[PDB]
Design a protein around this ligand. Structure first.
Ligand SMILES: CC(C)(COP(=O)(O)OP(=O)(O)OC[C@H]1O[C@@H](n2cnc3c(N)ncnc32)[C@H](O)[C@@H]1OP(=O)(O)O)[C@@H](O)C(=O)NCCC(=O)NCCS
Length: 158
């Protein structure tokens, strides 16, 4: 009962409201637009009833590796943001978004790994990443503004 496709500039508003509704980290419009162009092949939306109800926003970076079994310097895919509207959760959306984005990160921008930051209290997110074989590879102490820690979580791509 849903549909995956690459993000397009007319989704930006839907993407923004979802961001505003779901998350405390509320980037200005131009931030989504810029990533959408730079890394659009790996930028996906989830669609139900011709509405956007979930999105994933990537950045591709180059720098030091997060993971033991990778080389020192690497191309890495950074999940900057991912949200699904509360009404539509547990229906497999965030798993699919991550999978599409990873496949793209790998085959479109040559990522060797994909990492992210997640609040240590965000149990259902942590559960989703571990299920897709992300591992906790660092605890960022007092990472968020309120002072909450994050786990940096990461996973190689071959
Ligand atoms: C809710 C959220 C964590 C996952 O979205 P989702 O669409 O439900 O993801 P999925 O349906 O693909 O869930 C797949 C797995 O993630 C875990 N998971 C997802 N929602 C969960 C929930 N309420 N409770 C416990 N585990 C959950 C589970 O391990 C699930 O596996 P399973 O259903 O086979 O048992 C998150 O992506 C979201 O939409 N909103 C929360 C926003 C947030 O706090 N952080 C997002 C960026 S850090």
């Amino acid at each position: 009962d849903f549909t995956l496709r690459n993000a397009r500039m007319d989704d930006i508003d839907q993407i923004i409201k979802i961001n505003r509704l779901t998350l405390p980290e509320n980037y200005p419009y131009y931030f989504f637009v810029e990533h959408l162009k730079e890394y659009g092949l790996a930028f996906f939306v989830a669609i139900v009833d011709n509405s956007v109800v979930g999105y994933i926003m990537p950045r591709i970076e180059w720098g030091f590796s997060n993971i033991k079994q990778l080389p020192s310097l690497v191309r890495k895919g950074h999940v900057v943001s991912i949200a699904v509207l509360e009404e539509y959760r547990r229906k497999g959306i965030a798993t699919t978004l991550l999978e599409a984005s990873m496949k793209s990160m790998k085959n479109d921008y040559n990522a060797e790994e994909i990492y992210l930051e997640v609040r240590v209290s965000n149990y259902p997110a942590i559960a989703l990443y571990e299920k897709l074989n992300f591992k906790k590879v660092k605890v960022l102490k007092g990472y968020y503004a309120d002072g909450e820690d994050a786990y940096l979580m990461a996973r190689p791509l071959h």
